[PDB]
Design a protein around this ligand. Sequence first.
Ligand SMILES: Cc1cn([C@H]2C[C@H](O)[C@@H](COP(=O)(O)OP(=O)(O)OP(=O)(O)O)O2)c(=O)[nH]c1=O
Ligand SMILES: Cc1cn([C@H]2C[C@H](O)[C@@H](COP(=O)(O)OP(=O)(O)OP(=O)(O)O)O2)c(=O)[nH]c1=O
Ligand SMILES: Cc1cn([C@H]2C[C@H](O)[C@@H](COP(=O)(O)OP(=O)(O)OP(=O)(O)O)O2)c(=O)[nH]c1=O
Ligand SMILES: Cc1cn([C@H]2C[C@H](O)[C@@H](COP(=O)(O)OP(=O)(O)OP(=O)(O)O)O2)c(=O)[nH]c1=O
Ligand SMILES: Cc1cn([C@H]2C[C@H](O)[C@@H](COP(=O)(O)OP(=O)(O)OP(=O)(O)O)O2)c(=O)[nH]c1=O
Ligand SMILES: [Mg+2]
Ligand SMILES: [Mg+2]
Ligand SMILES: [Mg+2]
Ligand SMILES: [Mg+2]
Ligand SMILES: [Mg+2]
Lengths: 274, 276, 271, 259, 257, 271
Amino acid sequence: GVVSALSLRERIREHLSSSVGLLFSGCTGINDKTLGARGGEVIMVTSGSGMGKSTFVRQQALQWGTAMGKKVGLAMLQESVEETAEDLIGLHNRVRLRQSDSLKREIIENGKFDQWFDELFGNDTFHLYDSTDRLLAKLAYMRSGLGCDVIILDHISIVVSDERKMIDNLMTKLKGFAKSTGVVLVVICHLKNPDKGKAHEEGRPVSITDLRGSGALRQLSDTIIALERNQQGDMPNLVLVRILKCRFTGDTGIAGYMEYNKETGWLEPSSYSG
Amino acid sequence: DGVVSALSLRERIREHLSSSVGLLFSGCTGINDKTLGARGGEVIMVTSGSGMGKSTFVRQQALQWGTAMGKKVGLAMLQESVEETAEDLIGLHNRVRLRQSDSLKREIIENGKFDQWFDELFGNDTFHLYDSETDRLLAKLAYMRSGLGCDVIILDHISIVVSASGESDERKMIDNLMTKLKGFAKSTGVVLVVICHLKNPDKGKAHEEGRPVSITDLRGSGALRQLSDTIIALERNQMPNLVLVRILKCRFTGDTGIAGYMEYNKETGWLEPSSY
Amino acid sequence: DGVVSALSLRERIREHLSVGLLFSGCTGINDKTLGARGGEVIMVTSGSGMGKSTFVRQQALQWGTAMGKKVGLAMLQESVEETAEDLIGLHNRVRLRQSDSLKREIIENGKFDQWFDELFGNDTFHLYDSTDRLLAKLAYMRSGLGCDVIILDHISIVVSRKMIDNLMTKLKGFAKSTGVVLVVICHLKNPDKGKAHEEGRPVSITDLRGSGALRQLSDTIIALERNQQGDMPNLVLVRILKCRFTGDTGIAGYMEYNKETGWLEPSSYSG
Amino acid sequence: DGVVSALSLRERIREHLSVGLLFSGCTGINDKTLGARGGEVIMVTSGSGMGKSTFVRQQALQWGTAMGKKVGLAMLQESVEETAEDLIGLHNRVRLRQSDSLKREIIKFDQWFDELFGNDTFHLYDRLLAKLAYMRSGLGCDVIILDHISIVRKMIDNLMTKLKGFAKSTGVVLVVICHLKNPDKGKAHEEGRPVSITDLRGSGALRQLSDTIIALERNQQGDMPNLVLVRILKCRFTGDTGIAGYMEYNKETGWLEPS
Amino acid sequence: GVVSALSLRERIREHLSVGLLFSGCTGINDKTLGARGGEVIMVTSGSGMGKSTFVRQQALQWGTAMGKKVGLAMLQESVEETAEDLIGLHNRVRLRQSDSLKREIIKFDQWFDELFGNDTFHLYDRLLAKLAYMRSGLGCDVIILDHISIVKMIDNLMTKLKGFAKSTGVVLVVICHLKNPDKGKAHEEGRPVSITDLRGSGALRQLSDTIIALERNQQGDMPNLVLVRILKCRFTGDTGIAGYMEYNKETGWLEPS
Amino acid sequence: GVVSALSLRERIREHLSVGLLFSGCTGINDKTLGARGGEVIMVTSGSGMGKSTFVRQQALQWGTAMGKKVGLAMLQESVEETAEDLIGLHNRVRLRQSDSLKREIIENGKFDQWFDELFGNDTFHLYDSTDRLLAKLAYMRSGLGCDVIILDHISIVVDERKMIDNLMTKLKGFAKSTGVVLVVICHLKNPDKGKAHEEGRPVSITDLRGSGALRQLSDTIIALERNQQGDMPNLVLVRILKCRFTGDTGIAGYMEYNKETGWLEPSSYSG
DNA sequence: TTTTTTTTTTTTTTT
Ligand SMILES: Cc1cn([C@H]2C[C@H](O)[C@@H](COP(=O)(O)OP(=O)(O)OP(=O)(O)O)O2)c(=O)[nH]c1=O
Ligand SMILES: Cc1cn([C@H]2C[C@H](O)[C@@H](COP(=O)(O)OP(=O)(O)OP(=O)(O)O)O2)c(=O)[nH]c1=O
Ligand SMILES: Cc1cn([C@H]2C[C@H](O)[C@@H](COP(=O)(O)OP(=O)(O)OP(=O)(O)O)O2)c(=O)[nH]c1=O
Ligand SMILES: Cc1cn([C@H]2C[C@H](O)[C@@H](COP(=O)(O)OP(=O)(O)OP(=O)(O)O)O2)c(=O)[nH]c1=O
Ligand SMILES: Cc1cn([C@H]2C[C@H](O)[C@@H](COP(=O)(O)OP(=O)(O)OP(=O)(O)O)O2)c(=O)[nH]c1=O
Ligand SMILES: [Mg+2]
Ligand SMILES: [Mg+2]
Ligand SMILES: [Mg+2]
Ligand SMILES: [Mg+2]
Ligand SMILES: [Mg+2]
């Protein structure tokens, strides 16, 4: 029902000291113009194909799970449960686990696998999802029934597969689920084809209207983060982060540069100056 | 019946061109020269890109109409909850940014300045909010107009009430909602601000890069530019704060075009008039 | 039966052949379509803000005072007091509603009632104050009042393609049966490529919202195009799109608007 | 049974094979589809205002003065008086319902009336299938023209099957007019867009159950709005289709004449 | 449809080494291995493309070259027109279109008996019993039906036709019409026909056995240069573009070029 | 579906305790690490530059030399033609290039020696010809117990964007959670400007025709470039365009085409 | 408890 503005004296008070930003890792130019992430705050993450969307969000989920105490729930749909679990273990132990059979055969026999397991999953902070209406119900049981603080979804086009009406209704339902709940919602979508010139995977600067499916994805999201790297140029591991849209602050543009470490799998804050 | 002879209609005209008319905008001077304010029974539709000041400019207008003029103003803001839009108005009235600083929130918690800034604004029943199927939204707007008596009702983000209901074709539901909304506005005679988005251009620049928005760029139907009485478009190029105003269609006068310029003050949050 | 041979028709042809209602502004209309005729349906087409109701209000004024014909307006787009004030101001050469320094001036000067019965003195103008009910009210205007012209401002909000085909067939049947000059206004569709109509794109007969039978059952189509965000948003172009009683179509004339008064008055503009 | 061998058929073929009704204006029609024949269904289709009924009224005139066949008109679009006044003005070479001085100058009205109604040729029309069966059995009509099919998918397919069955039963030349569909991309038909056989409202039976289709295309908002292009879209007897010729209108007279 | 590697033990040797044949652009029966009994052969194209011309040419070439008893069902016209057309097609002279020659040749019985002297053809001016009589009491090995557009009610009819053909074993040709294209060109200006373009229901391509189609740019540069497409063939599987025919307006025979 | 990370104590241990490598070119092996359960490998080239040659060659080398069940579903040609291609390529002859060779093999009984050397171990399966296809491939994977499944010529299998998007989504969701290497053969779209693909244009990642889902659901993307008009028309260039597992893309290596046995060999071309 | 025509609006690609 409707509300009267004198009954909001006791609740705006309670909202005033409750809101709290959750900082990003890997680049400090993101945190200075976003002030983190709050309860009821849909964050769209995008790049070209294979430019590093799942690795970045997996690093963010790792840093919010073992360093800040936040209970993080994932719904990675590109991959299975054990694949992303082994990638989390190999990333928290600063190596490249699944891309080497020698290390996987080594760490299973000397008994240090339980040492690398219980340093993460001992506190029970991470949660995973096993693969339109049942998805949001299981996210609601993930939030209220368990108690997670950040909920991550990946590769939104599985849910829609008329696409524009369904993706608009889906984006509306995810924004309405994020609001009145108190959970950061990280959403990943891809970019359509470039019309002329070069491509987004060759380093073409991403604009805001390339979020494929509708134009309703940039109109129900709060913070839109875009990554881009030129795999054909001179430095194929130099990503650029661009804030396309920020509703809470209004500061957008080039955040900063990062460098990816092929031996550890961590992308780390670079000192690159254009 | 309902067929009116134009001879037995004298007294109504004697009580129509006597009294209303007025209720000017704020932030830019050249807007009020063209549209001559907002009137009862009209529909004013404000459009921009994404995150481009179509809620900040309307909150900055709803402050000036509900405080400095005594008009009871209702806000169906459906993008955010009631706790944030009632808290950004306190900062805008006191010329700060209360949500964008955790230092000032703790400062007004400690010394008790929050009660001063709360009873300065919400002391008189002027701002009427709502927290959250299109046959209940207009029911709540009728309960606001008939029961509480708002003089300016602002419906923000009309795209959330066309997509939260199960309908096959989107254009017919937009047209039916728009004509029922104009009927409610003309029946009750309340000023009605509607906020909606724009669609993707086919090629060239985008709306967030300096694209001059035309009247055909309204997203959803063609019933948006045919059933509204005043259309205001706000345009910027992220000088990422200089927002200019275009009047697209005024039914009352004939003046449409480049109204003027506004600027956004980063520490306070106001739309000051500019000069260029 | 209902068959009639062509030999036994000497009388009814003799009483049928034993120019029409002229227009106002841009003198190449009644040069081209030769005015309106009893039992037609006329479509007035433009984009939003281009002056459709502004154009037809003037014709309702010139057909209700200088010609004496009983006129019935049906403005579903507005109310009765606003169109009554606009008629009073349009006949008195003063833009009435758009100036508040004169609205209270003429009501204490006493010349409001001098301006009222000067044009509303006869029983000429009849207004409609808000589908089958609409047809019954148009029939009550035709039978119970004897209207010579009936104007309808907005066809679209009658609709709660088939419901528009049935509507246009029923209105054409009413116009052919009673012989009343019926003017109906409609809007244009959203084009897929290029400019809108409001930036001065010329209108084709395809651009009609709802269906395509709006052009198949009317007898003439008058389109008005004006460059709204341009160097002059007052000069309009009038294009006659269809004429079944003469045949000639194309660009007829031009009407400047003369912002001080409000009369669409013709101009010279070659190319 | 109804089975008939091909050998017991020598009689009924011998009486059968021992051109038809020509057209006036655009002489590459009867050069191409060899004119009209009995039992058929003919479609003359174009856009609104392109000049369909002017063409078919000229053909109704020329099939009742030089030929003498009983012509039954069915103009559900307008009145029975206007369609006769146009025939009188078209025969008398001076346009009638547009010069208002001549309408009271002629009132030699009966001299113009009886000169073209001195026979019992024409029959106008003021359920519709029963009226056409009456016009065919009790009146001997050789040509029947129908201008308005629209107010008369499934209920259009049934109507077209019933009209084809009536034409097959009676052997009457039958002209039917319907309109074009609304094109969703590109120009309108009225600025010179050539008509495809898809461009027909209602359903697809209008091209499946007829026997020939004639289309007129003219650039209406152009420099020459009085020059129709005539296009044959279908002909079961010949197969010869395409662009036929060009007719000028001659506003002064009203006669579609070739050039 | 999943074939193991052992099941081609002799069949590749079968690659290392028919029925009724078709006329014109001889890669038809080179691709579908000719017509066979028990089949339901569909010839579907646009209006004016020449379905009746094609199937009438095949009805002539299956009654003079083979001598098999042929039954026609030309419900699109009458029994005299479809006989005059066969006589004119056999005698290399376009008959019903030339006004002078129709009264010049009336040698009429000489042209009649040379092609109708046997008991080959069986024409037609309830329908299931008529088809069963034309099979059983008349010995017809080929039955042709030209108009099904006037005869759930199409699915029942097609199941009943297919059960009749299964019970008998007769070559059966049925012609229906295409659907209206929703976007692009029409079938008559050179748009290639897909298998989905069939009216009524979807069982027309699921209870048939082979489908032939024709494409020609009718309002075009050369409207007499057709292209033939095979859309389905349960025996072979070889589908696609078959060949080219010109019409030869003076004669009426679809001759290959 | 709601999974706590505490019950993964023994499942992850089961997952740790495998790449299937590419033959004929070690340059593909240097930057792909083979193929694991759920590794969709998209293969493409120009207009006739040898897609099915290379994919059938890898199917031949994975079956008769490594003991993996390979299921082909070649839809360019039928079952007998791809069986003739398998046997004539494994026996290193040009089978369909001369009629004199097809006659010699059947007169001396040495054809029956060539069925036993390949098809006797049941390490190959074929397919005889979209929602009717996945239920067959699921029984091919689960019921037979195969490991590699190949699909060819996607253009006949598939608004041609929603179809190929749903197809690619269904194939990726089938390859996941089942454990198959699903090789998918696609095409390239036609070049607008510059040089053509028959002349040696460097291929781009956005030339996968039909949608953009062909590079956004793949795990590995391999393309082939051959200049059939240039200096060496028998020289192909293998280019990795996408890798999810490693991320190392570019010119993998070179292979040389042969007009004597039909094969293509590893090359040593320098630039 | 199935199949064909008409029409206005948002996206992704095609020779
Ligand atoms: C960020 C980054 C990743 N990589 C490598 C390591 C990652 O495992 C691999 C990409 O893995 P992902 O990030 O998981 O792939 P993606 O989500 O960007 O694309 P898609 O879902 O469409 O397949 O690329 C680099 O080589 N350089 C880089 O800078
Ligand atoms: C007008 C303007 C706003 N801003 C800031 C003010 C606000 O904090 C923020 C705009 O937030 P909102 O007003 O909420 O954004 P919006 O209504 O225009 O669109 P949407 O709801 O689809 O996102 O940007 C600028 O930085 N520069 C400007 O010129
Ligand atoms: C014709 C014309 C109108 N006008 C202005 C004066 C009128 O007060 C104002 C109103 O135009 P309207 O006549 O009301 O325009 P419309 O009815 O076609 O649009 P809609 O009903 O969809 O809203 O237009 C001009 O300024 N110049 C002109 O040339
Ligand atoms: C063919 C032609 C017609 N005309 C005009 C003159 C005639 O008065 C007019 C005839 O109008 P109609 O032919 O009666 O219009 P219509 O029948 O196509 O439309 P509807 O669907 O409503 O029945 O066409 C020309 O001016 N030049 C021409 O070349
Ligand atoms: C195939 C072909 C036919 N024709 C002509 C010869 C025929 O007399 C004319 C008609 O062909 P028909 O075969 O008679 O057409 P149809 O009976 O199948 O039509 P529908 O069922 O759709 O009503 O087409 C050509 O001119 N060129 C050609 O290539
Ligand atoms: Mg990914
Ligand atoms: Mg907003
Ligand atoms: Mg109006
Ligand atoms: Mg007509
Ligand atoms: Mg036929």
